[PDB]
């Protein structure tokens, strides 16, 4: 009788991607907030493991009709800065948006430029980032990034295709997220290193006469505190830790 | 007993219960009518059915026909003939 078919406890909800306050606009720094760490981890993975389809030819040439269906969510690296076809280029100059590549620019690779390429039909988007110089990370001989001339004429560019105005789930790179170890501290001990018998193992702790130097005398604060952080449910310093384990805060 | 089948996928079953009057030490049998549910239209008027309560199916339908204990052979044969399961009565309720 269309009223006694089911319960009403869990009704249909409006899709999460049709609410403006849930969709990330690509013209704001919040877009670059969501993607930068994925680029950092992808470059770290590419530096230490051969990932299959990350280094490629000029550009993935899919038909103009399948472009927006097959292309979005796809990522690839290329040697030298060359931009795809049929795109309008917008170079982001906003410091509030460029601040989010600081850990990418310093600890992985110096970033030359960041640009947003909007399709002529305004339905697909390409975040493309040009890096310069060699990697600040050690690159393995087998790592797929070691097959790039620009890394290790010295600039190479990453491209990441995504749909505009979608929730932050679009801006997710999960499959490029497997932690492969980088063997830096073991090569010296390995047989491949002639700096192999030069290290003297420490099997025993040295006999210690001195005790650890005492810390400077503890000075109680002199300002008005907000209360007990453990009581107010503030994690240590509001930064990290556990409410139960209070530390590094006042007292 | 199935009493009416004018509604689709629904059987009206007349059921009886007992009320007790201590003063007169009496056991008088009352009657109650229930909308049952038979999805395949297998109940004919005059069937002795076993009915069981369940979830609600309609505004007034919270029972179903668990089993037909004694079908109306005459009713089925009349329906084969193309008549009504039981000839309609000639008396009824007054209009005023």
């Amino acid at each position: 009788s269309r009223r006694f078919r089911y319960n009403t406890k869990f009704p249909a909800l409006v899709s999460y991607n049709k609410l403006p306050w849930e969709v990330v606009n690509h013209e704001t720094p919040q877009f670059h907030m969501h993607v930068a760490p994925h680029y950092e981890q992808l470059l770290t993975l590419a530096a230490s493991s051969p990932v299959p389809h990350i280094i490629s030819s000029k550009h993935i040439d899919v038909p103009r009709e399948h472009r927006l269906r097959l292309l979005p969510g796809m990522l690839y690296l290329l040697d030298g800065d060359t931009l795809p076809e049929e795109f309008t280029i917008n170079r982001v100059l906003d410091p509030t948006a460029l601040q989010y590549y600081g850990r990418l620019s310093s600890q992985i690779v110096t970033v030359e430029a960041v640009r947003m390429l909007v399709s002529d039909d305004l339905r697909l988007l390409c975040n493309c980032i040009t890096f310069k110089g060699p990697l600040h990370l050690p690159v393995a001989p087998y790592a797929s990034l070691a097959s790039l001339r620009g890394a290790s004429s010295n600039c190479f560019t990453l491209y990441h295709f995504v749909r505009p105005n979608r929730p932050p789930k679009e801006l997710q790179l999960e499959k490029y997220y497997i932690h492969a170890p980088c063997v830096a501290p073991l090569s010296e001990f390995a047989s491949n290193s002639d700096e192999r018998g030069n290290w003297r193992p420490r099997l025993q702790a040295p006999k210690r006469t001195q005790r650890a130097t005492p810390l400077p005398a503890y000075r109680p604060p002199q300002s008005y505190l907000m209360g007990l952080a453990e009581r107010l449910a503030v994690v240590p310093g509001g930064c990290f830790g556990r409410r139960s384990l209070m530390w590094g805060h006042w007292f | 007993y199935v009493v009416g089948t004018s509604m689709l996928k629904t059987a009206v079953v007349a059921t009886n219960h007992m009320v007790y009057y201590p003063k007169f030490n009496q056991r008088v049998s009352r009657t109650k009518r229930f909308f049952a549910h038979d999805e395949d239209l297998a109940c004919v008027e005059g069937d002795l059915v076993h009915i069981k309560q369940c979830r609600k199916i309609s505004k007034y339908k919270h029972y179903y026909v668990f089993s037909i204990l004694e079908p109306n052979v005459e009713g089925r044969e009349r329906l084969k003939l193309g008549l009504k399961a039981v000839p309609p009565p000639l008396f009824g309720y007054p209009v005023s």
Partner: protein, 107 residues
């Protein structure tokens, strides 16, 4: 196919359906019409919506607005009661005049 399943709780009808049998009374013309004109109206409505979408959009907007901007859309217990006029009798007459009677069925 005349006895339901005591342990699974299946009715006579489900037992027969699982056995592959058919215990259906001979239907009259009006009953067969009831079982036949379910598809015709669906096809008519779907064809209407496919053929002239301006009027279909208008009618759908009317329905949606009339529902959304409607009172008693909470899906609380009062709205969820099956028989409002009989479950809530004291409301009728002196508070609610939608129903002029408190009994519409065997209950």
């Amino acid at each position: 196919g005349l006895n339901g399943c005591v342990e699974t709780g299946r009715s006579r009808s489900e037992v027969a359906r699982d056995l592959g049998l058919s215990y259906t009374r001979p239907l009259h013309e009006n009953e067969k019409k009831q079982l036949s004109h379910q598809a015709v109206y669906y096809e008519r409505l779907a064809k209407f919506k496919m053929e002239q979408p301006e009027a279909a959009r208008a009618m759908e907007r009317e329905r949606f607005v009339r529902k959304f901007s409607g009172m008693f859309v909470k899906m609380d217990i009062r709205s969820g009661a099956p028989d409002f006029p009989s479950t809530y009798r004291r409301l009728l007459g002196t508070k609610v005049v939608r129903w002029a009677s408190k009994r519409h069925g065997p209950n």
